Design a protein around this ligand. Structure first.
Ligand code: NAG
Ligand code: CL
Ligand code: CL
Ligand code: CL
Ligand code: CL
Ligand code: CL
Ligand code: CL
Ligand code: CL
Ligand code: CL
Ligand code: CL
Ligand code: CL
Ligand code: CL
Ligand code: CL
Ligand code: CL
Ligand code: CL
Ligand code: CL
Ligand code: CU
Length: 235
């Protein structure tokens, strides 16, 4: 159970974005139904009044929280991967539009999942803004908590992989469009019951065996890391 507070750009906090430049849901409940429109941008997908200005090559940091800013972030039980996707705003996230900019699942050296590291990072993870066409975009940050992913929601609706999905409205101003955005996958649609990484038993299967759900990360990506870029508590 986690939500996005806002973003940072190049290490500078852009301010509370909830319902402003984040298409925030009303609470931190997961989405579980892989076929639902809620997979696109969560349960209150509508245009919000602001878009954060960035340029190609900027670092865009999402900052998550649980109940209050810079708290425990997400329950430690919620081991799983993190991804970030991009789509043009004109799509409203519909159709085959989402292109993967970042994936992190399990770090063997550290023996930690992405979520574990997100907690350590005070909720912060980043991507580098790609050289796509200037214009309005949606950046879709997605945390998959696997603690009940031994079951499939479609079979047992009280269990399943839990998706914490947040869409930020981002305007890319300066970019040479030298890596134009390639085809994307749909959400809902890309993840199905048989997709690798959706059904997994984190209690019996070694974490080193985990394969996150495709698509692969786009070659045009620059991204990205799970790491604290700024100290929220100084504000
Ligand atoms: C899952 O989402 C689909 C598509 O919106 C819907 O038809 C179905 O009823 C949902 N399942 C549940 C259990 O709500
Ligand atoms: Cl839970
Ligand atoms: Cl609710
Ligand atoms: Cl739940
Ligand atoms: Cl759901
Ligand atoms: Cl704006
Ligand atoms: Cl808060
Ligand atoms: Cl916990
Ligand atoms: Cl960190
Ligand atoms: Cl550029
Ligand atoms: Cl679907
Ligand atoms: Cl498994
Ligand atoms: Cl993986
Ligand atoms: Cl590619
Ligand atoms: Cl980064
Ligand atoms: Cl700082
Ligand atoms: Cu939760």
């Amino acid at each position: 159970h986690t939500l996005v507070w806002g973003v940072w750009v190049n290490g500078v906090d852009q301010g509370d974005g909830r319902n402003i430049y984040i298409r925030s849901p009303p609470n931190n409940n997961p989405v579980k139904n892989l076929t639902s429109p809620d997979m696109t941008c969560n349960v209150d997908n509508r245009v919000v009044p602001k878009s954060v200005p960035v340029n190609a090559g900027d670092t865009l940091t999402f900052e998550w929280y649980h109940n209050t800013r810079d708290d425990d972030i997400i329950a430690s039980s919620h081991h799983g991967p993190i991804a970030v996707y991009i789509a043009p705003a004109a799509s409203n996230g519909q159709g085959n539009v989402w292109v993967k900019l970042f994936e992190d699942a399990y770090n063997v050296t550290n023996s930690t999942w992405a979520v574990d590291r997100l907690i350590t990072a005070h909720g912060q993870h980043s991507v580098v803004v790609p050289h796509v066409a200037p214009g309005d975009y949606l950046f879709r940050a997605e945390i998959i908590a696997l603690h009940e992913a031994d079951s499939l929601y479609s079979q047992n609706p009280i269990r399943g992989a839990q998706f914490y999905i947040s869409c930020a409205q981002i305007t890319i101003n300066s970019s040479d469009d030298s890596t134009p955005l390639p085809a994307g996958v749909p959400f809902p649609g890309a993840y199905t019951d048989s997709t690798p990484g959706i059904q997994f038993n984190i209690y019996t299967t070694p974490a080193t065996s985990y394969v996150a759900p495709p698509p692969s990360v786009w070659s045009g990506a620059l991204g990205g890391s799970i790491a604290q870029v700024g100290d929220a508590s100084l504000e």
